[PDB]
Each structure stands twice: as structure tokens, then as C-alpha cells.
Design a protein around this ligand. Structure first.
Ligand code: NA
Lengths: 105, 107
């Protein structure tokens, strides 16, 4: 359910997205990134009609990491109509992320 | 004694944990902008103080075992080691004056 976005695809996949997109800016070795990943997938499976969930590997896509000044990981950014509207830092439980996504799901 | 050094997952135990000099490790990444700001600051501190303090750089994505070991979730993170004990954790880019103040008593 989760989609992979890159520096090349970001504009089409996220900024030009008809529906809201939550982007997980993550890195490979980071504990909280490993933990939040399946939580996001379970959210994407449950709320797929309302919300797209995307992953952006910061090490592989440094242009987009830098554009949103990602300096803590994971950083989750909600995009609505081309604009970043929520920024959530750290692993979060399913319930905590659903709090942050209230009115979007 | 006058310049920064590189440390790795393979070299960390010998270079940092077993060092008799204090060591300041810069946990940095290619994808993180503020790391570019702090790098020359660290070099300037090494020039002035390298006989007393080793300044080491650890690229977190190349060295995932050490990055995870110190639970570095913000970049850059600078960790001071004294006798292998992590005694201070400094988060984010800092000015030369600011970093020198963080290193009070060390340099
Ligand atoms: Na890298």
C-alpha cells in the first residue's frame, strides 16, 4: 500500500497529488524508522481511499530531504494541495498517527 | 593533532572507545545540510586544539552499527567520549564559540 517516491518522482507523486499524501522521510539503520514503517503500512491499508502514504529514503534522495530541511528521522510530512500542512517527528503508535491525521482519514 | 579524522564501524572501538585523548565524534550525513555548516567549524577547533582533543567524523549511513548504537536520530549529533564513556551529546550545527563553550574543561 505504501508508495516509494524519489527526487525525480516527488513533483508528480506528491506535490501534484489530487489526494493528501503523508511522506515518511526515513533512513535505513534508524530504529524508530524500522518501527514506524509497518505502522504506516497498516494505516495505508485501512485508509487508502482517503490518504496516500509514501516513503522517501533521505540518503538516496538528498535533494528532497534538503528541500524540507529533514534533520531528524523519521520525519513525516503531510501534503495537501502541494503544501506541507503537518510535520510529525519520531516513531509514533498507530493511535498517535491517527490523532495527527484527524480529519484527513 | 591538527586535523579531523575518519572513524568507522570497524575502527570505532580502537579509535574512539579505547582512545586516551577525549574524542568528539560528529555523527553526520550526506543528506543533511547543517552538517556542511559544522564541518569547517570542527576543522578549526582541530587546528587549535587537536593535541588535546581528537575530532572524528562518522558517516551514519556508511556506519549503521555505530549510528544505531548511539541512537542518533537527529543529525548532526556530536558526542564527547572520555575513556569511552559518552559524557555529552550536542545536537545540531553550532558556531565555533558555542561549541568551544560546550567543550568547557576539555579544550
Ligand atoms: Na550518504
Amino acid at each position: 500500500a505504501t508508495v516509494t517516491v524519489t527526487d525525480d518522482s516527488f513533483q508528480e507523486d506528491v506535490v501534484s497529488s489530487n489526494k493528501p499524501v503523508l511522506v515518511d522521510f526515513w533512513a535505513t539503520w534508524c530504529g524508530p524508522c524500522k518501527m514506524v514503517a509497518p505502522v504506516l503500512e497498516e494505516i495505508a491499508k485501512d485508509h487508502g481511499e482517503a490518504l496516500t502514504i509514501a516513503k522517501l529514503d533521505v540518503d538516496a534522495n538528498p535533494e528532497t530531504a534538503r528541500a524540507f530541511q529533514v534533520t531528524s528521522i523519521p520525519t513525516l510530512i503531510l501534503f495537501q494541495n502541494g503544501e506541507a500542512t503537518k510535520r510529525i517527528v519520531g516513531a509514533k503508535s498507530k493511535s498517535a498517527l491517527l490523532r495527527e491525521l484527524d480529519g484527513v482519514v
